[PDB]
Write a protein that binds this ligand. Structure first.
Ligand SMILES: [Mg+2]
Ligand SMILES: [Mg+2]
Ligand SMILES: [Mg+2]
Ligand SMILES: [Mg+2]
Ligand SMILES: [Mg+2]
Lengths: 138, 234
RNA sequence: AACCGGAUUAGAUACCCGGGUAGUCCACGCCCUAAACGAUGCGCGCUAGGUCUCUGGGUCUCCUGGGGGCCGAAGCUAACGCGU
RNA sequence: CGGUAAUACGGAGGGCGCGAGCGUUACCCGGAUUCACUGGGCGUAAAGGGCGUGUAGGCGGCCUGGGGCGUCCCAUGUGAAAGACCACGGCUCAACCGUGGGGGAGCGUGGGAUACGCUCAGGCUAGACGGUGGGAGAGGGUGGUGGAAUUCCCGGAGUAGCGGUGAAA
C-alpha cells in the first residue's frame, strides 16, 4: 500500500540525488512539507514547491550538489551525503531532550518531531523538548 | 562567420546508438534521427573557445587526437597549421601516463635521423639499411605529431570521444583538461569542454576543428587563409 | 524394477543383447516427498538506456499498457554475478 | 617441534619478565558485531516454508475536528546506610579509615504541549474492489470423436531366414 510515506520521501531524495537529478516529485502531505522546510532552511536542498500532477498534489523538490570536480570521476560531491529513517512504523523511536543525538560532532542534522512541532536537534534542545526522532541528515 | 554554417550540414547526427547523458543537447528525434540543438552548440562553443584563447595566449600546448576515418587527415593538417602536436593513426597505451617511456621512442627515432644524415647515409651491414630504415617507418607513421610534444600537454582536443576514450581516461588521470567535439555517441560528463556537434560529417569535423585553429594563432597574430583542408571534400 | 536367460570381464550380482512380473492406464480412496530450482517468500514506492518477443489499446515511423528473454547507467556483491 | 648439525626435547652458559613471590589447573566477563537493541545474515558459503487460501496477530493513503492512552516538558515525593565517584582530613606513606560534596534511571503525585503513534466523529479519491465494452491462452472438470504407429487374430500372396552386436549368442 505504501507503508511509510516519510521514508518513501527520504528515499526518493536519496535515489534522485545519486543520479544527480535536478528535481523530484513526491506525493504531498503536510507532515512531508514540514520535514522539507527544515531540509531547505539548513541548505541541504534549494527548496520545494507544491504542484499538481494528474489532478493530484505532489511536492516538487529541488536538490543541490557541490561543484563539478577534478580528476577521473568529475561527479560532484553531494550536499546530502546521508539521509536515514530512525523512527519507523515497525519500531518507533522517541527521545527526551536529555538524550537527543549530536549528529557528526555538530556538522549534522537530526530532524525530530515534538509537541512544539517538527524541529532540528539544536532547535529542540534549546526549546528544551524531545520527541519521535524522525531521521538524520549529514 | 558561424551561425548558419553550423546548420549547413553539421547539426544533428545518429539514432538509438545514444547516450541518455546527452539528453540536454538535443532539439528532437524527428524522422527517426537525432537532431541536435544548435543554440546550445554556440553557448558551449564560446565557453570552449574562451578556454582555448586563454590557454593559447598564455602560450600553452593543446594535443590533438583524431584517429577515425574522416578525421585522420584533417587532423595532421590543422595540427600543424597551428604548430601543435597530434596523434593520428594509433593512440598508444600510456602516451600521457607512460609518457617518459613512450618518449624514448621519439628519443631514439631522431637518433636515426642522425643516421639518414651521416657518414652512414649509404653504409652499415646492408640488411640494417632496411631493418633500421624500416624500423623508422613505424616510428614515422605514429610519432608524427607526438615528436614535437616534449612535456605533458596543457589540454587535449578529441574528435570522437567515445571512439577515443582511452585517451580521455588518461587525460583525467593527470588532470589534463579535455576538449572534445562530442555527439550522441558520447558521455558529456567526462568531456571537460564540450563542442556538442556531429562527430562524423567531414564538413562538420572541418568547419569546427579548423576554426578552433584560427584562435590558436589569432592569439598571436598572422592568421592564414581558409587553409589546406578539403582532402577530397566530395 | 524384480526375475529368467545370452554376452563381456581377472571377476561382472553392471553397463550391451533376448524375454519378463509388479508397475505404468481408468475408477474410487490413501501416502505428502523431491536438485517441489530462479537453489532468489509476498506486497508496495523509488532509481539511464538499448534489443528480440507474446498479448491488448491509440492519433498504428512508432506511442501506451500487461507478460517473456538478452545486454548492460547508478548502485550492490568475497567474487561469479544481479542490474525497472 | 623430534627420522645424527634441533634457537621448539634434556643439561650447560647467557638472556628476557616478574620478584616474596612466580608458575599451573578450574570458573566468570573480555576480545566474539561469533544471538548482531546498540550491532549480523539467507542465488552459489549455515540459511526462503513445495504452492495456495486465509484465523489470530504485526503493519496502514490524503484533509479536518474532539479526546490526551502512547510520547515530550516542569514542579514535587521516593531512590536507607555501606559501596562507586570528587574533594579535604587520620594512622610516618599507602592499604585501611573518617568528614563533606556531587549525581541517577524506574515509580507515585500536581500541572502543561498535541507534531508523531493510538482512539472517536466527519469528509476526500491517487490504494483496493465493482460496472460496461473488448481480448489471448496445452488453466481445470465431463462427455464424445479422429488419424498415424506398434502388438495380436483372420484372409491373400510368398520362401528361408529374421532379429540382434563392437563381435556375437
Ligand atoms: Mg532388458
Ligand atoms: Mg557479545
Ligand atoms: Mg520457493
Ligand atoms: Mg494471504
Ligand atoms: Mg595524609
Amino acid at each position: 500500500m505504501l507503508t511509510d510515506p516519510i521514508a518513501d520521501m527520504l528515499t526518493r531524495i536519496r535515489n534522485a540525488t545519486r543520479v544527480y537529478k535536478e528535481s523530484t516529485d513526491v506525493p504531498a502531505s503536510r507532515f512531508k512539507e514540514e520535514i522539507l522546510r527544515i531540509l531547505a532552511r539548513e541548505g541541504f536542498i534549494k527548496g520545494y514547491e507544491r504542484v499538481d500532477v494528474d489532478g493530484k498534489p505532489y511536492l516538487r523538490v529541488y536538490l543541490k550538489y557541490g561543484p563539478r570536480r577534478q580528476g577521473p570521476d568529475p561527479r560532484p560531491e553531494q550536499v546530502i551525503h546521508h539521509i536515514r529513517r530512525i523512527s519507523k512504523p515497525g519500531r518507533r523511536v522517541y527521545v527526551g531532550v536529555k538524550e537527543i543525538p549530536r549528529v557528526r560532532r555538530g556538522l549534522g542534522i537530526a530532524i525530530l518531531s515534538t509537541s512544539k512541532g517538527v524541529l532540528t536537534d539544536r532547535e529542540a534542545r534549546k526549546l528544551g523538548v524531545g520527541g519521535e526522532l524522525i531521521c538524520e541528515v549529514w | 562567420v558561424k551561425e548558419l554554417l553550423e546548420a549547413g550540414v553539421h547539426f544533428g547526427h545518429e539514432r538509438k546508438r545514444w547516450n541518455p547523458k546527452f539528453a540536454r543537447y538535443i532539439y528532437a528525434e524527428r524522422n527517426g534521427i537525432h537532431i541536435i540543438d544548435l543554440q546550445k552548440t554556440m553557448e558551449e562553443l564560446e565557453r570552449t573557445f574562451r578556454f582555448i584563447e586563454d590557454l593559447a595566449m598564455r602560450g600553452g600546448t593543446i594535443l590533438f587526437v583524431g584517429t577515425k576515418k574522416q578525421a585522420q587527415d584533417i587532423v595532421r593538417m590543422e595540427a600543424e597549421r597551428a604548430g601543435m602536436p597530434y596523434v593520428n593513426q594509433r593512440w598508444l597505451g600510456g602516451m600521457l601516463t607512460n609518457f617518459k617511456t613512450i618518449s624514448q621512442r621519439v628519443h631514439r627515432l631522431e637518433e636515426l635521423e642522425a643516421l639518414f644524415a651521416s657518414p652512414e647515409i649509404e653504409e652499415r651491414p646492408k640488411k640494417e639499411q632496411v631493418r633500421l630504415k624500416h624500423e623508422l617507418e613505424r616510428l614515422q607513421k605514429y610519432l608524427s605529431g607526438f615528436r614535437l610534444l616534449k612535456r605533458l600537454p596543457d589540454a587535449i582536443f578529441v574528435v570522437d570521444p567515445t571512439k577515443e576514450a582511452i585517451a580521455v581516461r588518461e587525460a583525467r588521470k593527470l588532470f589534463i583538461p579535455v576538449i572534445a567535439l562530442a555527439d550522441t555517441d558520447s558521455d558529456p560528463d567526462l568531456v571537460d569542454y564540450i563542442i556538442p556537434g556531429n562527430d562524423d560529417a567531414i564538413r562538420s569535423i572541418q568547419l569546427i576543428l579548423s576554426r578552433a585553429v584560427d584562435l590558436i594563432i589569432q592569439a598571436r597574430g598572422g592568421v592564414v587563409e581558409p587553409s589546406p583542408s578539403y582532402a577530397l571534400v566530395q
